[PDB]
């Protein structure tokens, strides 16, 4: 019974950690896109 409870808690924590890491990875994905575009258009504006 304690293993059931502990593994349910572990699964819930893993799901919450997956959600947090997915939100993060989305933030760095958007930030990488932005930064790449900033570099590209900074080179463009100077040339």
């Amino acid at each position: 019974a304690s293993r059931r409870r502990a593994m349910k808690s572990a699964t819930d924590n893993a799901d919450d950690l997956i959600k947090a890491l997915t939100l993060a990875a989305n933030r760095e994905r958007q930030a990488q896109i932005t930064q790449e575009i900033s570099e590209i258009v900074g080179g463009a504006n100077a040339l």
Partner: protein, 506 residues
Amino acid sequence: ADIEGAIEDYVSSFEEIGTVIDAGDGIAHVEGLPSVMTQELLEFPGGVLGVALNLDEHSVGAVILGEFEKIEEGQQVKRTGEVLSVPVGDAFLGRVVNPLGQPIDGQGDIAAETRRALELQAPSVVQRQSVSEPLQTGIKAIDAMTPIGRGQRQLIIGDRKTGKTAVCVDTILNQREAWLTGDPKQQVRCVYVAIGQKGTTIASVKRALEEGGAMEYTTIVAAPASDAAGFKWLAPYTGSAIGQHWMYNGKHVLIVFDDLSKQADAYRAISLLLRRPPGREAFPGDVFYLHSRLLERCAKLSDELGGGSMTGLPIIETKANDISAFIPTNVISITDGQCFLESDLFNQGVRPAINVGVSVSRVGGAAQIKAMKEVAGSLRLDLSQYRELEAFAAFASDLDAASKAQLDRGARLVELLKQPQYSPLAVEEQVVAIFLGTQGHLDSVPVEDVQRFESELLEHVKASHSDIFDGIRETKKLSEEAEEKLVSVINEFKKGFQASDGSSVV
């Protein structure tokens, strides 16, 4: 030799008309207008207005405010003679106006007292005064846990559909009792600024304020999602100017910016269209200034300047409740506290979804009335520890007597802070309600009925024992005699209260 004189003569020589030479997606360049001021308001032939941002040697680059579709090359642009400014006055109460002060509610024109510039400096350090009197929001959670004082900047931050407008509309509605007093030192005037919100949501808000009798002291500055970036960029500033005209006259204003993340988006659009190199998340470096400039004018003026105040409830719409993003962090570092509304709590029926933990009020406490601070002093820590203990106990094999008592008290406190929309509570009713819970009088009531037991109980007090409410309202303190009378009334009511479970709540 004579060239310098001759050239100088020319500069000297300068109802003057310029002509548009470029135009596109909000920005129009106007050659001529040698005597235009920076931030001057230029009127184009179709009644469209623009702000002269850049003043080059040659033409002037202006951000068009409104229908930029009607701006075309060769059109005549003529000065208004007024730096970026909007009409102000009491004629704006009960009206819906666009960021330029032009009415859009279909009623008549507004009789402005004067014109106020949108970019006047905020009160200096010596011109302000410590926030010392409360702005009752009518929300038990906010007025008990993170109280707002007049002159404070409180940030309503949360995700979509987390209940943020409501927490602002309820705050505006709760000022009707103060308005009916007729005392300028008590009346709180409201300016609800809608930036990029759906037109139907502005209509809803106006309907709610009308059915609550709140429009007779509220002004709505509407910049719906259909309007260009210029309107969504000015709307907070015109709202703050309407409010400032009252603030400097001794009146107390409540400004709601709904939502400042859309002003930031509009300013980002304008900046990128001006080809200004962006920074973090594509926002310009001025994006902080944009908001710091705006919320710094919400202040509690010193008694030398009439003692007026402007309270700001800026709204920020976080994405995936990421309170560490750029604009949210900027506004948190600008404002005096945040009411963080979580979508997790709000989806599970806890509405207002005030996350007690992250939510805080820096400037409050000094503003909270004595009775509320006495009854609600321990509420915040109790609720936070209850959330943590409920997270712990969800998987623990057993709960001690003290732990179970804490859990039972916290569940009833949460159910007590739960409150229906467009149903703000007077401060005395909130005092009694939080008294019911913090003093354990709810421990004998089943959780599911806490909302009803409370809701009915206040009615009884309004109907048969108003002396308690009158005392709390007048002396701003819950006296021990009134406390004993309230306890007696609570016990008397619990005898006749019919619980849903059937069991007596005595």
